[PDB]
Design an enzyme around this catalytic site. Structure first.
Site, PDB file in Angstrom:
ATOM      1  N   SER A 173       0.819  -1.192   0.000  1.00  0.00           N
ATOM      2  CA  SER A 173       0.000   0.000   0.000  1.00  0.00           C
ATOM      3  C   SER A 173       0.875   1.273   0.000  1.00  0.00           C
ATOM      4  O   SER A 173       1.901   1.292   0.687  1.00  0.00           O
ATOM      5  CB  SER A 173      -0.947  -0.043   1.195  1.00  0.00           C
ATOM      6  OG  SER A 173      -1.850   1.078   1.178  1.00  0.00           O
ATOM      7  N   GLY A 174       0.481   2.318  -0.789  1.00  0.00           N
ATOM      8  CA  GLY A 174       1.215   3.601  -0.893  1.00  0.00           C
ATOM      9  C   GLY A 174       2.541   3.475  -1.633  1.00  0.00           C
ATOM     10  O   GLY A 174       3.336   4.425  -1.695  1.00  0.00           O
ATOM     11  N   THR A 178      -1.045   2.631  -8.242  1.00  0.00           N
ATOM     12  CA  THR A 178      -2.019   3.483  -8.876  1.00  0.00           C
ATOM     13  C   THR A 178      -1.404   4.595  -9.714  1.00  0.00           C
ATOM     14  O   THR A 178      -1.815   4.853 -10.834  1.00  0.00           O
ATOM     15  CB  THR A 178      -3.136   3.852  -7.869  1.00  0.00           C
ATOM     16  OG1 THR A 178      -3.749   2.643  -7.458  1.00  0.00           O
ATOM     17  CG2 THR A 178      -4.219   4.687  -8.448  1.00  0.00           C
ATOM     18  N   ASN A 221      -1.450   5.697   3.040  1.00  0.00           N
ATOM     19  CA  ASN A 221      -1.652   6.398   1.794  1.00  0.00           C
ATOM     20  C   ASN A 221      -2.845   7.290   1.908  1.00  0.00           C
ATOM     21  O   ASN A 221      -3.931   6.770   2.239  1.00  0.00           O
ATOM     22  CB  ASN A 221      -2.066   5.333   0.721  1.00  0.00           C
ATOM     23  CG  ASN A 221      -2.017   5.775  -0.741  1.00  0.00           C
ATOM     24  OD1 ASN A 221      -1.950   6.960  -1.085  1.00  0.00           O
ATOM     25  ND2 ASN A 221      -2.010   4.788  -1.623  1.00  0.00           N
ATOM     26  N   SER A 224      -5.717   5.745  -0.887  1.00  0.00           N
ATOM     27  CA  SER A 224      -5.602   4.303  -1.035  1.00  0.00           C
ATOM     28  C   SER A 224      -6.674   3.764  -1.911  1.00  0.00           C
ATOM     29  O   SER A 224      -7.825   4.248  -1.835  1.00  0.00           O
ATOM     30  CB  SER A 224      -5.711   3.567   0.278  1.00  0.00           C
ATOM     31  OG  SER A 224      -5.289   2.224   0.112  1.00  0.00           O
ATOM     32  N   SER A 225      -6.288   2.787  -2.733  1.00  0.00           N
ATOM     33  CA  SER A 225      -7.300   2.116  -3.575  1.00  0.00           C
ATOM     34  C   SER A 225      -7.904   1.062  -2.672  1.00  0.00           C
ATOM     35  O   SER A 225      -7.154   0.190  -2.228  1.00  0.00           O
ATOM     36  CB  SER A 225      -6.613   1.302  -4.644  1.00  0.00           C
ATOM     37  OG  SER A 225      -5.701   2.111  -5.384  1.00  0.00           O
ATOM     38  N   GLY A 445       0.074  -6.492  -3.531  1.00  0.00           N
ATOM     39  CA  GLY A 445       0.956  -7.675  -3.486  1.00  0.00           C
ATOM     40  C   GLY A 445       0.654  -8.433  -2.151  1.00  0.00           C
ATOM     41  O   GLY A 445      -0.409  -8.190  -1.536  1.00  0.00           O
ATOM     42  N   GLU A 447       0.282  -9.257   1.481  1.00  0.00           N
ATOM     43  CA  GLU A 447       0.001  -8.434   2.604  1.00  0.00           C
ATOM     44  C   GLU A 447      -0.014  -9.203   3.909  1.00  0.00           C
ATOM     45  O   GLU A 447      -0.837 -10.093   4.093  1.00  0.00           O
ATOM     46  CB  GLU A 447      -1.220  -7.532   2.405  1.00  0.00           C
ATOM     47  CG  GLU A 447      -2.606  -8.147   2.680  1.00  0.00           C
ATOM     48  CD  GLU A 447      -3.674  -7.189   2.151  1.00  0.00           C
ATOM     49  OE1 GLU A 447      -3.166  -6.383   1.220  1.00  0.00           O
ATOM     50  OE2 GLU A 447      -4.860  -7.126   2.546  1.00  0.00           O
TER      51      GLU A 447
END
Ligand SMILES: Nc1ncnc2c1ncn2[C@@H]1O[C@H](COP(=O)(O)OP(=O)(O)O)[C@@H](O)[C@H]1O
Ligand SMILES: [Mg+2]
Length: 719
Positions: A173-174, A178, A221, A224-225, A445, A447
């Site tokens: 994440s972050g 994206t 993030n 975040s998505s 990926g 986690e």
């Protein structure tokens, strides 16, 4: 010519500076074995056929074995564009090259098939039109590493091989998945769309919309998505964009009703609240997020450097572009608004184990805006009829239970709406007349969080399959690049099986079995698991002490999971009367969401795990039909700061993602030990001059496969 023009930004920002002018041995040692990731460089004072002996930073010697030696590549390699060129492939060496680059703001590097991307955490002007322009039609080796480059190579391969393509962009994440994903899209829209071109804009305007509804601020993030995606960019036989399709996955529906301290709920809530007109507000019986349960809890209702107001313009603006009808919009906002009211409802115990709705306020607001009937919502909420034999009895729920159902409702609606947004966008963008496509996958990926639940298992199952696909791809190459006289994805099989197996049944199958089941609990559930796998399946671990956790040995290591709520999550229930209430909605949109089997239902219903496995397989089936490309996005630290690349944070990632793994083979797996041009016929002359040893060197076919050996002594030689 910018590629030639050393003054160009291109050179500055994308290349290691060319200073045109035209006997030692270091190691990476760790001054603290407890710090496996904090190396220092030290000189080797001497060797011994058995070991090496260097000089600490302090200049007070130590001594490891050769076979334990993390030899430092020659300095000339410091900053090379592809880690395939290093002599010494080892963690620190790898890290060191990434670093040297990162230090020059060179966030992109290849590692064989991979494009490694380290979030810079600041703007780097490299995504300009001029930049696009520079990448057209150039081979990977002809230009600097960059996401445009990979995007270009996929587009060419597509036009040249007449084969579908895929780009797999993952990482934590972050990390910038994206960001990179948008750039891919952008570049593609540029090099293959209409110039002197509406579909393109539409294609572009779709991301802002999905972001408003599916991204949010988290602690890792600010945007975040909270859903995974697969973007199919569609081309006609001529190589121009004919269309697009978006597939979304695992939206975090829970975030609508709960956010950790400091985080936010979805963007759209804020944008709506802060972007609505003084008139829609009241029209919408709206107010400030402060006044909203679903938005007053985390302590954060803002994002620094972000204008919900302005961002609302966009979303809206984008909505228009794609084509949403004004009313569709209003309706979309009614849902949001609606959802907000429901969060406001308050169940109290009004007599004895039964909730009462003493204040019909929030209820009225919700309903009104949902265009539903206050009276039945209520009854659907506090007293749903439950089948118990032939019997269909209405059941009075306490307060807890009443709230959860309300929450379940909030979540289906949100979830359902997203689903709709996606279709509706596809309707406008999709083309099944397409000749070809280039698909971009943007999802997390592996986690490993403080706490890992059903959602993490899913994501990690996917990752398990994505990594095996990488490994297989990688052996195909080798195998094929050997039309002459070791399958790696076989190694991922056991893990895969543990999760998804049918016979013997794996975790998901056991979970499904339990979800129908009579004596159904988190505890029966975890018992069944250990019963089937503890000490029985090598990839499984029953905890010494926890009674609610279990461990899976994943590709990237063990991950401990907790089973609380898996049964409910697997069934994702929603009171039918509730289904009934909304089914009869005034709203044209609400109706869809509840009336469209394609929206209101999973595929005789399957479970969430079953739906997940399936959509996973479909995905992979798709990929198998493509020529894939691999993007590994790396987060440089956990602080959201530029200039701070922490060893430990970085090395962890290179071990999990398979850059490191992928690499070590890149020792044996020496294709890219092909220096077609080197310091062909005298290229044995040299070997014969320095008289190096046979079988450290290799004669291909003008091509090559030299030695990651003399090679790293074969450069700072004086002659
Ligand atoms: N190339 C890049 N340049 C600048 N910022 C970037 C870049 N890649 C990512 N970021 C930074 O990291 C933040 C989060 O990155 P993001 O792409 O959203 O990651 P992910 O989707 O992997 O969770 C971005 O909003 C931005 O601040
Ligand atoms: Mg993302």
């Amino acid at each position: 010519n910018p590629i030639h023009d050393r003054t160009s930004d291109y050179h500055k920002y994308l290349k290691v500076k060319q200073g045109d002018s035209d006997d030692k041995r270091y190691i990476w040692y760790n001054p603290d074995p407890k710090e496996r990731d904090s190396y220092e460089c030290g000189e080797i004072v001497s060797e011994t056929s058995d070991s090496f002996t260097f000089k600490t930073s302090d200049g007070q010697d130590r001594q490891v074995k050769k076979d334990d030696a993390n030899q430092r590549n020659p300095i000339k390699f410091d900053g090379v564009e592809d880690m395939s060129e290093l002599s010494y492939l080892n963690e620190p060496a790898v890290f060191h090259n990434l670093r040297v680059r990162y230090n020059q703001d060179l966030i992109y590097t290849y590692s064989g098939l991979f494009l490694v991307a380290v979030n810079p955490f600041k703007r780097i002007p490299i995504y300009t039109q001029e930049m696009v322009d520079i990448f057209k039609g150039r081979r990977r080796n002809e230009v600097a590493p960059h996401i445009f480059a990979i995007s270009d190579v996929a587009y060419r391969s597509m036009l040249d091989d007449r084969q579908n393509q895929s780009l797999l962009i993952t990482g934590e994440s972050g990390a910038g998945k994206t960001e990179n994903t948008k750039k891919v899209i952008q570049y593609l829209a540029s090099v293959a769309g209409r110039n002197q071109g509406v579909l393109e804009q539409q294609i572009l305007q779709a991301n802002p919309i999905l972001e408003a509804f599916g991204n949010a601020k988290t602690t890792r993030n600010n945007n975040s998505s909270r859903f995974g995606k697969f973007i199919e960019i569609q081309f006609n036989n001529a190589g121009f964009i004919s269309g697009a399709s978006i597939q979304s996955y695992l939206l975090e529906k829970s975030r609508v009703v709960f956010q950790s301290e400091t985080e936010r709920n979805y963007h759209i809530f804020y944008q709506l609240l802060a972007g609505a007109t003084a008139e829609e507000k009241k029209a919408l019986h709206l107010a400030g997020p402060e006044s909203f349960n679903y938005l007053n809890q985390s302590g954060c209702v803002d994002i620094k450097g972000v204008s919900d107001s302005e961002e609302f313009k966009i979303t809206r603006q984008a909505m228009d572009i794609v084509g949403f009808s004004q009313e569709e919009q209003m309706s979309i906002f009614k849902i949001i608004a609606g959802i907000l009211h429901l969060g406001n409802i308050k169940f109290e115990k009004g007599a004895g184990e039964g909730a009462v709705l003493k204040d019909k306020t929030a209820l009225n607001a919700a309903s009104t805006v949902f265009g539903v009937n206050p009276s039945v919502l209520e009854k659907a909420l506090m007293e749903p009829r439950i089948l118990a034999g032939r019997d269909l009895v209405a059941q009075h729920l306490n307060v807890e239970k009443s709230s959860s159902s309300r929450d379940a409702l909030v979540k289906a609606l949100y979830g359902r709406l997203f689903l709709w947004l996606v279709k509706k966008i596809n309707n406008v963008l999709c083309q099944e007349r397409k000749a070809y496509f280039i698909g971009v996958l943007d999802i997390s990926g592996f986690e490993i969080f403080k706490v890992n639940s059903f959602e993490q298992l899913c994501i990690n199952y996917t990752n398990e399959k994505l990594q095996q696909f990488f490994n297989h791809h990688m052996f195909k190459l080798e195998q094929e690049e050997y039309l002459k006289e070791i399958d790696f994805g076989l190694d991922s099989q056991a893990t895969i099986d543990l999760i998804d197996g049918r016979q013997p049944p794996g975790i998901l199958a056991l979970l499904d079995e339990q979800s129908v089941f009579p004596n159904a609990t988190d505890n029966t559930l975890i018992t069944k698991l250990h019963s089937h796998f503890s000490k029985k399946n090598a990839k499984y671990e029953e905890p010494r002490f926890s009674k609610t956790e279990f461990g899976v040995t994943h590709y990237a290591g063990q991950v401990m999971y907790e089973i609380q709520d898996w049964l409910e999550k697997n069934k994702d229930p929603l009171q039918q009367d509730l289904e009934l209430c909304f089914k009869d909605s005034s709203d044209n949109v609400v109706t869809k969401l509840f009336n469209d089997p394609n929206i209101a239902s999973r595929a005789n219903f399957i479970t969430v795990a079953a739906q997940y496995k399936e959509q996973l397989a479909s995905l992979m089936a798709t990929l198998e039909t493509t020529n894939p490309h691999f993007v590994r996005c790396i987060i440089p630290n956990n602080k959201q700061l530029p200039a701070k690349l922490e060893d430990k944070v970085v090395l962890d990632q290179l071990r999990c993602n398979g850059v490191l793994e992928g690499i070590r083979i890149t020792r044996k797996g020496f294709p890219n030990r092909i220096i077609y041009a080197d310091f062909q016929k005298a290229t044995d002359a040299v070997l014969k001059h320095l008289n190096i040893d046979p079988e450290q060197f290799r004669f291909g076919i003008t091509k090559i496969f030299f030695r990651a050996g003399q090679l790293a002594r074969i450069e700072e030689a004086r002659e």
